[PDB]
Amino acid sequence: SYCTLADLIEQYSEQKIREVSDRVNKPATTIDTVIVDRAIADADSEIDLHLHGRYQLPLASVPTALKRIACGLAYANLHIVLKEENPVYKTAEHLRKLLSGIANGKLSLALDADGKPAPVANTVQISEGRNDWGADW
């Protein structure tokens, strides 16, 4: 859960979330929590797809850039039909580009609140090191 309904409302205003989330009432009246939850879950799943090879999956903290990316992807997911030239689609593409840059080691995952994220041990591995005759015998 890198973003919440509060984050979506704050980033896109409550009116737009209501309009793109209420599918049964015309005009919209309330925000459907289930739809928003599914959209946020899908955004988190995509982000994990991008970040699985460099960091641990169950992150204990959410970096701020991760919050922005999740909010953007979740909003893009709340559109049933999304054309290519829709600006929301372009924002989603830019965020996906940021994610790909992070995955390819060109961008670093920033601070969460004060501490660093938790990188995986992929680079750590070395055989073991056989150096007998060099132990001050």
Binding site: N104, G105, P119, T123, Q125
Partner: protein
């Protein structure tokens, strides 16, 4: 000659110390944090002793020549100095240019 021999011996000892594994330099892309930098540094440091290791495709390790040559120059200098010392102390007929074997009355 003593100073020449001392310098040659010390240089040879240093070169023998450096001999063995090659110097290998690791490279990392932008956005590598300090912890990952330290992990890469330790991996490179222990890579020579360690037969195998794995790194991300975005990183790179280059094995550069460490010290390639021979002991011939050093040993030549040591032999020259020792011959000079032998000639100066005991003469250049028995010690440096040894008189070799051969008995008789």
């Amino acid at each position: 000659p003593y100073l020449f021999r001392h310098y040659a011996t010390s240089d040879l000892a240093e070169m023998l110390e450096i001999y063995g594994l090659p110097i290998r330099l690791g490279k990392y892309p932008p956005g590598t944090a300090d912890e990952e930098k330290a992990t890469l540094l330790r991996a490179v440091t222990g890579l020579g002793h360690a037969a195998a290791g794995i790194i991300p495709e975005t990183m790179a390790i280059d094995f550069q020549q460490a010290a390639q040559g021979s002991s011939d120059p050093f040993l030549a200098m040591m032999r020259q100095s020792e011959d000079a010392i032998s000639k100066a102390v005991l003469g250049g007929t028995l010690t440096s240019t040894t008189s070799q074997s051969g008995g008789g009355a």
